[PDB]
Amino acid sequence: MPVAPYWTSPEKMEKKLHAVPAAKTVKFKCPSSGTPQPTLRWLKNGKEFKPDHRIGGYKVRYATWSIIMDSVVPSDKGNYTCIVENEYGSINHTYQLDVVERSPHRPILQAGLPANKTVALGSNVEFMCKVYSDPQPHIQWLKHIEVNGSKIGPDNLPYVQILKTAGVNTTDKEMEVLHLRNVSFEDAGEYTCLAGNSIGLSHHSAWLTVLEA
Amino acid sequence: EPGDGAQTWARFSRPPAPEAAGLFQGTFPDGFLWAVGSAAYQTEGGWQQHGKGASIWDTFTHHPPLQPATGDVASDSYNNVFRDTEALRELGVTHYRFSISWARVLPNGSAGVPNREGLRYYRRLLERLRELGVQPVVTLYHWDLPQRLQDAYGGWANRALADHFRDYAELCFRHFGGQVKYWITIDNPYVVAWHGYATGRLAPGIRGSPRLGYLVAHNLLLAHAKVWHLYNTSFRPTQGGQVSIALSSHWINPRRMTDHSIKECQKSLDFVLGWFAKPVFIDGDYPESMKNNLSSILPDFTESEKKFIKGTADFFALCFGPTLSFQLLDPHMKFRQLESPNLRQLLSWIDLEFNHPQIFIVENGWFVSGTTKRDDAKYMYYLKKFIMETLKAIKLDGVDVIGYTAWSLMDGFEWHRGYSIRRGLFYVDFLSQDKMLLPKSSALFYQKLIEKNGFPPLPENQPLEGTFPCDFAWGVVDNYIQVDTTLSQFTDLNVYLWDVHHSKRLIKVDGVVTKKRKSYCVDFAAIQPQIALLQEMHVTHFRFSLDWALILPLGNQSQVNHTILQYYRCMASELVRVNITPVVALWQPMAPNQGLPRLLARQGAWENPYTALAFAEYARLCFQELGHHVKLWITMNEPYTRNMTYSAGHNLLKAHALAWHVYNEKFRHAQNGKISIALQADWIEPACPFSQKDKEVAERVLEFDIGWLAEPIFGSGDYPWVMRDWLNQRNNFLLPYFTEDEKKLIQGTFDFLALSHYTTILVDSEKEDPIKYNDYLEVQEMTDITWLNSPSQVAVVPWGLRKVLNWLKFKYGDLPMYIISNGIDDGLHAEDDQLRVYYMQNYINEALKAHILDGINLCGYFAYSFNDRTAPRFGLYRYAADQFEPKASMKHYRKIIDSNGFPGPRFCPEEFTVCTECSFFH
Amino acid sequence: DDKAMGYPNASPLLGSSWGGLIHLYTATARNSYHLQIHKNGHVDGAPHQTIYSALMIRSEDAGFVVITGVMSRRYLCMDFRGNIFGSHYFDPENCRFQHQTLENGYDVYHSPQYHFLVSLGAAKAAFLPGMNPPPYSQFLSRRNEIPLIHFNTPIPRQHTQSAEDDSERDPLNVLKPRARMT
Numbered sequence A: 001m002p003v004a005p006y007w008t009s010p011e012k013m014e015k016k017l018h019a020v021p022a023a024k025t026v027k028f029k030c031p032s033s034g035t036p037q038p039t040l041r042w043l044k045n046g047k048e049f050k051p052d053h054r055i056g057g058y059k060v061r062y063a064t065w066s067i068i069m070d071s072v073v074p075s076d077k078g079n080y081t082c083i084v085e086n087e088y089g090s091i092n093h094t095y096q097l098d099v100v101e102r103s104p105h106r107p108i109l110q111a112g113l114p115a116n117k118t119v120a121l122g123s124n125v126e127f128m129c130k131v132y133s134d135p136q137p138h139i140q141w142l143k144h145i146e147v148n149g150s151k152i153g154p155d156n157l158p159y160v161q162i163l164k165t166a167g168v169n170t171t172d173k174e175m176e177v178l179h180l181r182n183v184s185f186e187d188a189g190e191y192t193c194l195a196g197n198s199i200g201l202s203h204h205s206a207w208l209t210v211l212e213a
Numbered sequence B: 001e002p003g004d005g006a007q008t009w010a011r012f013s014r015p016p017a018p019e020a021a022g023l024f025q026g027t028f029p030d031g032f033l034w035a036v037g038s039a040a041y042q043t044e045g046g047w048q049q050h051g052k053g054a055s056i057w058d059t060f061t062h063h064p065p066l067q068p069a070t071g072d073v074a075s076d077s078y079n080n081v082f083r084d085t086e087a088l089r090e091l092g093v094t095h096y097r098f099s100i101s102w103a104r105v106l107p108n109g110s111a112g113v114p115n116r117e118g119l120r121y122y123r124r125l126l127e128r129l130r131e132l133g134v135q136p137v138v139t140l141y142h143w144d145l146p147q148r149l150q151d152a153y154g155g156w157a158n159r160a161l162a163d164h165f166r167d168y169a170e171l172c173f174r175h176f177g178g179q180v181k182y183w184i185t186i187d188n189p190y191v192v193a194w195h196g197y198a199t200g201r202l203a204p205g206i207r208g209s210p211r212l213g214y215l216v217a218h219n220l221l222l223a224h225a226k227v228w229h230l231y232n233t234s235f236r237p238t239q240g241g242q243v244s245i246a247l248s249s250h251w252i253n254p255r256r257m258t259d260h261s262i263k264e265c266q267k268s269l270d271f272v273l274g275w276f277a278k279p280v281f282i283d284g285d286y287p288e289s290m291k292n293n294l295s296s297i298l299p300d301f302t303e304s305e306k307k308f309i310k311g312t313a314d315f316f317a318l319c320f321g322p323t324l325s326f327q328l329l330d331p332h333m334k335f336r337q338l339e340s341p342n343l344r345q346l347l348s349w350i351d352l353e354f355n356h357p358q359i360f361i362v363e364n365g366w367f368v369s370g371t372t373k374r375d376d377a378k379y380m381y382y383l384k385k386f387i388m389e390t391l392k393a394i395k396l397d398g399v400d401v402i403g404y405t406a407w408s409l410m411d412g413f414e415w416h417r418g419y420s421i422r423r424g425l426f427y428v429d430f431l432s433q434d435k436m437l438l439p440k441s442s443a444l445f446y447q448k449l450i451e452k453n454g455f456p457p458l459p460e461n462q463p464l465e466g467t468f469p470c471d472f473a474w475g476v477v478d479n480y481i482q483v484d485t486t487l488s489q490f491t492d493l494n495v496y497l498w499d500v501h502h503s504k505r506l507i508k509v510d511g512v513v514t515k516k517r518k519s520y521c522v523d524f525a526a527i528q529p530q531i532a533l534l535q536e537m538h539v540t541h542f543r544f545s546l547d548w549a550l551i552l553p554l555g556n557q558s559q560v561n562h563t564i565l566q567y568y569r570c571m572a573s574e575l576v577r578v579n580i581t582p583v584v585a586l587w588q589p590m591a592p593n594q595g596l597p598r599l600l601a602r603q604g605a606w607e608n609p610y611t612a613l614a615f616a617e618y619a620r621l622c623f624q625e626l627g628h629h630v631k632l633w634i635t636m637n638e639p640y641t642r643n644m645t646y647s648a649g650h651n652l653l654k655a656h657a658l659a660w661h662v663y664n665e666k667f668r669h670a671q672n673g674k675i676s677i678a679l680q681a682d683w684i685e686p687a688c689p690f691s692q693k694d695k696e697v698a699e700r701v702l703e704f705d706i707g708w709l710a711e712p713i714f715g716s717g718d719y720p721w722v723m724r725d726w727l728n729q730r731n732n733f734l735l736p737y738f739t740e741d742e743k744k745l746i747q748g749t750f751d752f753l754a755l756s757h758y759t760t761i762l763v764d765s766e767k768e769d770p771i772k773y774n775d776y777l778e779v780q781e782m783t784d785i786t787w788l789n790s791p792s793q794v795a796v797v798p799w800g801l802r803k804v805l806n807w808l809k810f811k812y813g814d815l816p817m818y819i820i821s822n823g824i825d826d827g828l829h830a831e832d833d834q835l836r837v838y839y840m841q842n843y844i845n846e847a848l849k850a851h852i853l854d855g856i857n858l859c860g861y862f863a864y865s866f867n868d869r870t871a872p873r874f875g876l877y878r879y880a881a882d883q884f885e886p887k888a889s890m891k892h893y894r895k896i897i898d899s900n901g902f903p904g905p906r907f908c909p910e911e912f913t914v915c916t917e918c919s920f921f922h
Numbered sequence C: 001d002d003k004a005m006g007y008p009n010a011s012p013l014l015g016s017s018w019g020g021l022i023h024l025y026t027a028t029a030r031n032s033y034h035l036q037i038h039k040n041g042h043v044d045g046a047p048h049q050t051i052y053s054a055l056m057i058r059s060e061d062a063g064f065v066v067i068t069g070v071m072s073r074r075y076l077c078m079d080f081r082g083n084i085f086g087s088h089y090f091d092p093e094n095c096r097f098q099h100q101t102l103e104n105g106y107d108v109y110h111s112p113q114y115h116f117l118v119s120l121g122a123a124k125a126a127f128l129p130g131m132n133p134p135p136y137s138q139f140l141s142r143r144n145e146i147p148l149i150h151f152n153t154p155i156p157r158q159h160t161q162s163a164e165d166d167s168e169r170d171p172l173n174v175l176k177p178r179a180r181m182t
Ligand SMILES: *[C@@H]1O[C@H](CO)[C@@H](O)[C@H](O)[C@H]1NC(C)=O
Pocket: B052, B053, B107, B108, B109, B112
């Protein structure tokens, strides 16, 4: 009869880390038994786990030795320790709750970049294009060039050439500036900053005018 | 208390500070005891002189230019008393540990008629010791047992000898007790019991079983208590001396820091030291570890005996030397662990396992071979560290070490090793009829140390305050810059159709059109990140080299790789953009092809003379392109003078000279720059600083290291005199002579002196170890173990850079000198800068000493490597998964560069126009 | 004077600072693991953040991403059977995947040439427009919490420098040759 508290089904306790997005339900169960009925306590990073700490409350199911959350918030991240004890003997286990706060969106480009510039011939030009995206964006610098006489191909699209495209060994912050040293009259035209993640696309263009000294 | 020593390996697992790893200063506490040891059968001799009986060793040596190694005469100390006491006079020592011969005082194993002649010998010795002021430490039993007590009672295997050893101890307390105040009863009972009867490798034995050994040690541990209590209630209230027992032990290190390895290490010390230390300093009973594995063959202590043995030691007599360490220690008693000669943590382990006792090291030092005479550098540096770690145990650990005793005043019979090993501070010639003592190098070291009581602070190793000259070149090295032939932009020549409407993707056309513009510097997306690391580093000069095998792959100058030439052009131009002068080298001994193109290396490499000509043309190409931005060039970048041959070195000097003349006659008037070699200049120091032969082999080694290539260029225009002398005297004159045209061509081809210093090595003339002895140069290469080392075992000697700077000035006159490379690899692989920050803080300061205290015209310091990506471990920036992070050495070096040296609290920010031509101005 | 300061910017983000590496989290109610790539190209689950589980996400085409093990120097590649492993060499036909976020906030990656969802388990199923996802296929990008000091493997192995011998005449290594001549 004098039995120490033990873990009945340890297979339900292998999931150590619980990482769910915002507004999600998490279930922490610590199955145990013993004679007589043991108590089940919860510790939030070594403190009191009172329902008045988090907004919305929770639901502890004593029939399954579990606790159910409701719309987790980043304030609920940390470690949760369940304690089981009845007579002489106190077993415990610590879980880890993480709330991954992320929201996908199309790549946002800073308004005004790139900007139209004119520093005549022989000077140095550098266009910029501030890009930000959660699923990591791809950057390409295009130049609207002209082939043969005109500059519009089939259907109704302009001819462009690849100036700078990100690849494998490519810094995410080096594709933000397009350098043009010396420059010439051939470089006069339109420069586009094509950026896109896995949702949509976004691009800003700017004309370059080359004068004379 | 037993078990409190398991925390030692934990506290020694993390190095606290780099200043503690060296601790080249500090003095021992006042009252410390400096001593020197001796024995009976080692030095006395005369096994049948003045009615002396016969010991167990007298019979073991007789019955296995003679064949058997015996101790009948040995050092012959029984007939030389004044001879031995004069050595103690010169050493300045305070104590002297010698032993009484049992077979000599009591020739009959029954305590019958004491020998008045034998007692007179020890009385005369003590009388002179009193006049000199040397307090004696007498060892009653030092492995010498009378033969009468062996064939009658069975030796130490009989407990009846506890009263016999009591009688022999009585008269010694009676006669000589008025003068002696430090008594050792048994010297190392471990080897006497274990190797005496169980193994049989000492004086007695027949190889029976370990049970005989444990039983002998049982009786040994009883006889000691009998003698201690004989001294406490009979002689102490009327004499006041202290009685202990000389206990020897080893040290062990774990395998993988696991709890099993640590517990097996504790078991090894409890089996060797705790075998006797715990039943004497703790509770009188054997350690619990030995009680488990020896639950049958180990004798049992009665309860009345445990209290009788407990507390029978007024201090802890520690023995630690070549006695059992790597010799007589049983291999099984190590328990699959590593034997280490670490004395520091052993002192800390005894300090914790026995409630902070008074430690008195009664025997230490190491040993040398039998052929080693008066020059014993190996022994003096072992003795140097042995006392160094002891000082660390006092200042940093808190161990109450009360005295030190370097073992063996003189050479003599070394037990089973015979005479093939020498341990004394004074050389003895056994083949001579005089056998007078001759002071060794260690004896002079010990003498000079006792006179100052440790290691007082020396003025040479003191921090220096002051600033470097204005426009002093500060920078880093990068011998293997990662090339970036792939351009970042304007590479794709095809045109596409951008579907601006609907899906905003690109559609390539099947035609061909448009062209390619000229590639500028921004196309190489690798220069600006490295330059960005150099800007925050406040580096004013960046040193790197070129890849000859990539510039001209086909050897000849017809198929030129202009791409990497533009890479190097932009590398130098963007450095001048941010006010960083580039220092460019041409050739390096790296790569499997001696740093040569594959065709030139396959056609003899430097053994072929045409390679030198191909170097000059390649030099001219580099001077034409990069010469517009580069103002400091280097022909050869630290050629391995220790690995090359003479045929290759001759053509190497040709190649450097040809390149220097090409720049001097075709590019100097248009490019205000300088060109010179860069030689690796590791410092060499004589092992014995007062030995002439060590000094001349140090000079010879220095000539083959630096003079081989510096003398034909900076000096007499010929090869070193010492090098040609030693080679011609060796009849192996395979060194080519300099013809008049070659001498006229090579001599003078230098605009400065680029030095490369990393560490200093020690050299000794005598052949200490044959398999580690350089026969081509006749030099024993050594190192001072007291120096702070790196994980790659590279010595940290800050003053060696000052020494090599003075040597180059003396050898080649006043001359603008650069420090082209100087650094040290990482340490601990977590706190890498604990060693490098201390390395640069002192190595730079010692360099400033040479500029001010010696007048060296230093022009620049170049820290070796600024990233581990190109040169692992040696970098200042860390490279971990495509990320460069600045180490603490970056902020410390930047602190030195910003302060321009080590300024104190006159204070001048001098901008002297341009001075001494150490560098130039933009 | 007008002067030129700059343009609006909000500096780096998730990682240690600009350590833009993330660990791919996976939960299947019963268990929970991270996508890990070993030095030999073996992909398994790591219950916590390890050095071999540090992954760099870098998009390539219009909506396709590249998953690289920053510690093993290997790329995540998928074959025709649906398996995934690590290769030291890039291949746009196999080591390239398409990313898309579902409704529950979990990221899913599938091969454009094999339609197989990158799954830690043995359930290499295709993709369906919101039907039944196979286990170990819904990932969650979690920030990195490991300092960049642990991301470089050591080197001082050097097994048996001089063995034990039990008779070493120079244990403290006072005699150190330097390998000269030739
Ligand atoms: C004492 O030893 C001597 C050996 O020199 C021996 O001749 C003598 O008989 C011994 N006497 C006794 C009483 O054992």
